[PDB]
Design a binder for these strands. Structure first.
Lengths: 101, 474, 101, 474
DNA sequence: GGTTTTTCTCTTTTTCGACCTCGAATTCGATTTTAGATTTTTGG
DNA sequence: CCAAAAATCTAAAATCGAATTCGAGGTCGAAAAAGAGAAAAACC
């Protein structure tokens, strides 16, 4: 019933997700293959890709490049919060052909 | 701590016997009266010295310390004479005692101050016994060349338990107000709090540098009172040396005296004020060059604008902030834009958390100048300073010495911050300060050295599993 | 918990130096955590030292192994409490009386 | 929460506009004056009802509520008449208003109470505007059968942020004061704090049980004041219903009235007092049967001895403690010895941490009786109650109902506590309470089912290592 | 006079707050036996 | 009169506890700020 005013989106069951709050600003940022339809809070992000891909490759790509995509937008102030939206959003990764997925 | 730390503990013993602020007012008034009495006796009898004095009546001679120190104590109402007749009924003559130095109308009064020691108190004999016990306990403080007020610094630091400074950070920002400028004056302070950060330079430069006394402004009433007695304890000249009461956002004074030459401050954080704003304070002399005000949740940079208003043609400035005021929406962004409009903002230096009294956040200091080269230089600093147990650190005189060495001539030292460009900061959205720390300890390894080790792990592992299978005989 | 914090200068502080095979117990309000003194280590800030008077019977890594056998009370960290005398009483099984053969 | 929770939030809105205690005094005085005015008007005009009243002058008729409610409000100094002339200069007539019910010398005054609303305040117009704004904001509280004081319970719970009770625990210990005893009286309380725990029974038993009003004693002055107005709000008879001020360790009263029949309490913890002791308080009427005092760090059981002193021949008693008072050295051991000298200590029941306001420890309750069988029964209780987020739990009426079912007739229920013996407690060193929780979840397994599974792990593992060795082609 | 464009508010996102909140871990004062010595009393 | 034994008083190691504290790591509410739709003004 709470989706009347959850301010959330129900997402599909083959997704990835990533935190933007308070483990990074210090350390490694986690991520996980979420295998069920679900929702998350204010304090992290859900990502589905679009069809030109294989989704596990995106997961391993992000978990590989985590240690420098945290470096790209690390500080964002001395506040308790962490990485900006835009510089997180505006990173380029090498996306190959399907046989190299 | 040699012969000191025992007396620090004696002050801790004297800290009885109720909630701290109430008796603390009487404690500060007692030591204040004792110090004024001893300084006045030291002036009038440096050579025949008399414990008990006389009614010598010579007013013409009396008015000359009333021009010099501005206050006759009295003929016989000094402390050392009053210390003879202790426990004597009654005690309220001290009120009349505060009538004596408060005459002081000639010249430039600096009086109207000592209204702290009121009366509560429930009976007159309670008042007599309590105040006489306080005077007896403060008389036994064996202090007497005559360093006195550091125990006062302890007792004023013993509260909010406000937040003033861990005093080596004040010595640091004093060394930021350096260098080499025997140039009137020093030092103005908006929201001074105590006179602790308003002390270090001229106390170190008693006749090294010779400019003028100190000016400032502070919000609270009782903080204003303890600030005036704080600055009065440290044997500082009467000359113009004062702070006026008020708020810089509401009563900015003094404009006419003068464009200052050096300023330090500790502005409090998140200090939301009247919005946004109902008077014409956009169109004042200092916020109209910015372009927009400083609203409620972002009420910080009004202090730094008020700071940069009162500045000379050459003399530098140094203020403290916390790095959370980073971009803070477009209003603070355009405030930062007018700050980076020139080399107004010269350097910024971060300082590791906490190094304070349970705040627990990091801070940074902004050093400003109309003395340009010019490029921006974000020499921020992380670790190391110890922080929590005793003070801590506090703090590593060689470390601040070498950071002054870095501040001297613009080095580019990795594993530490370095210079940037104006092109870099317009490439930023005026950020404070992500650039330019580099080190991350991401250390390489070797494929083969790791994998043959893992093979050794397996050659241990499988035979130990075999021996467990041997041990499965039950 | 996790039995390791960082370095410190390891000599001339009156350090206990943690000789060949004592055992320790953690602690007041817990009395459950057990760690073999590995080689020669610190006296880190809460520890209580257990060894034995006898050598030719005890060999107290034997009783290190015997002490974690009994989580009977040691599944109860619940009340603010010291337990020193209480475990210090009894019991343990012993291959007596064919000692010291 | 149906039409309530909105008004709870309205009280939260009214919570402005300075530090809470200062304006909170005026808030409580305002709602107190409003409720007394409405109750007095409800008494005098239940049938011709008049918003505005007259100067009818008939003193002989006036003295009859001055015997009944003990206080005439006034002819025209009620709230509803004063609510017409709001914002009218001046405001200090309220002081003279407090002269009116404080006449009350006939009979059994219960006055001398309403000295809360003092004046600070810096100008008279500040006082007028502020107090008129407070009266206007408290007038708009749409409350009006007439449940009023639960918002008062909210506002008094909104501080120390003292610690009183999460009110279902008070309902629990009220149900411990049960059962079936229409027997004067209830209820004495040492260190009552609020009247919250002194409320539930007779408010539930308004004419179910009929014994007497309530007695008690409390330490602090302002806590005494808020306690008297707390117990006064809930429409309770004037009859003998009071608390006196003082400390039970220093002024134990009332001995002569009477040996009580039921008591509850919340004694504060670690409450060190004068030692050990300088007067002859060993040789009083209540500590001489013990054998030794309760010293400073172990200052708890003086309250429970003072509790068991004031008890009937049959009526039970219930107090709260924390289980850290366990053996606490030989002094508290021999205190426990005199407690277990009979079946004085009947039952003990533990309660899981926290179930309080950030304490964060567990507690336990001791139920005592001179109503014996006799054997000791340590029916302690662990989980489950939720604790932290909103209140929490709060709390599981079937769970307390079934623990009353256990308390009824002495069951022996495993996965839960049970009875013990006197031989068991002398086999203990009078411990409180290790016995008798049993369950540990140490669950067995199977050798073969585990090892062939581990063999399946190996048959996966070695071929996957082989495939890694295939993947070592670089 | 009608249509189009711009702005303002209202609906919906979204990104911060000298924090804050749960698991893990715990240093000083308060308080007690034992080590021991010294003094007093009793017995030879 | 002297010697021995017992009791008391003091130091100090030895225990013991703390309506907790420490700190690693995550808030949730809310201010405040951008996107759509509606209204108003200007131009053709």
């Amino acid at each position: 019933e709470a989706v009347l005013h959850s301010s959330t989106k129900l997402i599909p069951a083959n997704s990835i997700a990533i935190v933007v709050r308070s483990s990074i600003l210090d350390k490694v940022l986690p991520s996980a293959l979420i295998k069920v339809p679900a929702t998350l809070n204010q304090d992290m992000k859900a990502v589905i890709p679009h069809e030109n891909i294989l989704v596990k490759y995106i997961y391993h790509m992000i978990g590989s490049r985590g240690s420098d995509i945290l470096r790209a937008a690390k500080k964002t102030g001395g506040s308790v919060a962490s990485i900006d939206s835009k510089k997180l959003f505006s990173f380029k990764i090498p996306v190959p052909n399907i046989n190299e997925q | 701590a040699e012969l000191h730390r025992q007396i620090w503990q004696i002050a801790n013993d004297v800290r009885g016997s109720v909630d701290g602020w109430d008796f603390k007012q009487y404690v500060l008034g007692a030591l204040f009266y004792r110090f004024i009495s001893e300084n006045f006796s030291s002036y009038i009898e440096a050579g025949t010295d008399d414990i008990k004095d006389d009614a010598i009546k010579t007013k013409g001679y009396f008015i000359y310390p009333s021009q010099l120190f501005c206050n006759v104590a009295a003929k016989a109402n000094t402390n050392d004479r009053l210390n003879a007749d202790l426990n004597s009924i009654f005690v309220a003559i001290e009120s009349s005692a505060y009538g004596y130095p408060s005459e002081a109308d000639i010249k430039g009064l600096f009086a109207d101050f000592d209204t702290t020691s009121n009366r509560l108190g429930n009976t007159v004999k309670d008042k007599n016994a309590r105040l006489a016990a306080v005077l007896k306990g403060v008389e036994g403080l064996k202090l007497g060349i005559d360093l006195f007020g550091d125990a006062y610094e302890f007792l004023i630091s013993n509260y909010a338990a406000e937040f003033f400074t861990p005093q080596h950070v004040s010595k640091l920002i004093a060394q930021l107000a350096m260098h080499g400028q025997t140039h009137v004056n020093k030092i103005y302070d908006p929201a001074a709090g105590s006179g602790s950060l308003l002390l270090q330079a001229k106390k170190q430069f008693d006749n090294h540098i010779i400019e003028e006394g100190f000016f400032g402004q502070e919000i609270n009433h009782t903080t204003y009172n303890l600030a005036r007695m704080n600055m009065f304890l440290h044997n500082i000249n009467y000359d113009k040396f004062d702070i006026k009461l008020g708020n810089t956002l509401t009563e900015p004074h003094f404009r006419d005296e003068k464009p200052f030459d050096a300023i330090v401050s500790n502005p409090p954080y998140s200090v939301k004020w009247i919005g946004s704003d109902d008077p014409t304070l956009i169109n004042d002399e200092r916020f109209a060059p910015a372009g927009v005000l400083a609203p409620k949740s972002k009420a910080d940079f009004a202090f730094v604008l008020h700071a940069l208003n009162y500045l000379s043609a050459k003399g530098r400035a140094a203020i403290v902030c916390f790095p959370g005021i980073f971009y803070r929406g477009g209003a603070e962004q355009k405030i930062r834009q007018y700050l980076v409009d020139n080399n107004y903002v010269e350097t910024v230096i971060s300082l590791a958390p906490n190094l304070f009294f349970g705040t627990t956040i990091a801070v940074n200091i902004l050093v400003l100048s109309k003395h340009k080269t010019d490029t921006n230089v974000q020499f921020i600093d992380a670790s190391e300073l110890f922080k929590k147990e005793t003070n801590n650190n506090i703090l590593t005189d060689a470390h601040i010495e070498q950071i002054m060495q870095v501040f001297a001539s613009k080095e580019d030292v990795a594993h530490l911050a370095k210079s940037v460009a104006f092109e870099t900061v317009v490439a930023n959205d005026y950020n404070l300060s992500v650039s330019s720390y580099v080190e991350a300890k991401d250390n390489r390894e070797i494929i083969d050295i790791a994998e043959l080790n893992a093979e050794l792990k397996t050659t241990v592992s499988k035979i130990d599993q075999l021996r467990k299978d041997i041990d499965a005989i039950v | 918990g996790k039995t390791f914090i960082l370095g410190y200068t390891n000599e001339t502080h009156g350090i206990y130096q943690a000789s060949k095979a004592p055992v320790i117990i953690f602690d007041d309000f817990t009395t459950a955590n057990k760690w073999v003194d590995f080689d020669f280590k610190a006296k880190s800030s809460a520890m209580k030292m257990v060894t034995s008077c006898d050598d030719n019977k005890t060999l107290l890594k034997y009783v290190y192994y015997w002490l974690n056998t009994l989580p009977s009370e040691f599944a109860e960290g619940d009340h603010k409490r010291q337990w020193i005398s209480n475990y210090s009483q009894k019991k343990i099984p012993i291959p007596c009386p064919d000692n010291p053969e």
